[PDB]
Amino acid sequence: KKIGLFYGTQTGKTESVAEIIRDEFGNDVVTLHDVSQAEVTDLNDYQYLIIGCPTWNIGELQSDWEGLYSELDDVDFNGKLVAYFGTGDQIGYADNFQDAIGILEEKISQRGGKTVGYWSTDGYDFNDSKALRNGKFVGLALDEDNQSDLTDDRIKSWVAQLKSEFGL
């Protein structure tokens, strides 16, 4: 009803985590939007947003999201609070781990969005990332290929953090 969660997914992991995030928030607070069936103008309807996008393209963005990216200039995000999460492989993409959410954040904050939900890089083994803001990632970094046993606990901690930041 109040937080719009827009995700794009390739193998379905970002979508399953989006449903978990939805449940952790509860009370009909978050409405899920698969970006394959969304329009950029749908983002304008929320004052609270959660952007989900995996990184599997070594120097490109998830197809569904790749499309919306070009039209992100058509939307004013000033006043909106935005959080980010994505899936990736810190070993197979050591130099580009979670690049997708960093690209998205750069664009959105330029348009006026305020990033909420920074997440610690501790416990990850990678080299670089466009999502790296230096001591923290721009949002929740998940790795189901190497750290699937840490996923639910990470989601649990991040949602508790977002509850405070979003004022829930």
Swiss-Prot record:
Q: Where is the Flavodoxin-like domain?
A: 3-163
* SUPFAM superfamilies on file: Flavoproteins
The answer, when asked if Flavoprotein is one of the entry's keywords, is yes
Cofactor(s) annotated in UniProt? FMN
Keywords, sorted A to Z: Electron transport, Flavoprotein, FMN, Transport
GO terms in the biological process aspect are: electron transport chain
Which InterPro entries did the record assign? Flavodoxin, Flavodoxin/NO_synth, Flavodoxin_CS, Flavodoxin_lc, Flavoprotein-like_sf
Q: What residue range is the signal peptide?
A: none
Which GO terms label this protein's molecular function in UniProt? electron transfer activity; FMN binding
The record, for NCBIfam families, names:
flav_long (TIGR01752), PRK09267.1-2 (NF006736), PRK09267.1-4 (NF006738), PRK09267.1-5 (NF006739)
State what this protein does: Low-potential electron donor to a number of redox enzymes.
Sequence similarity: Belongs to the flavodoxin family.
Protein name (record): Flavodoxin
- Give the species: Nostoc sp. (strain ATCC 29151 / PCC 7119) (Anabaena sp.)
Name the gene behind this protein: isiB
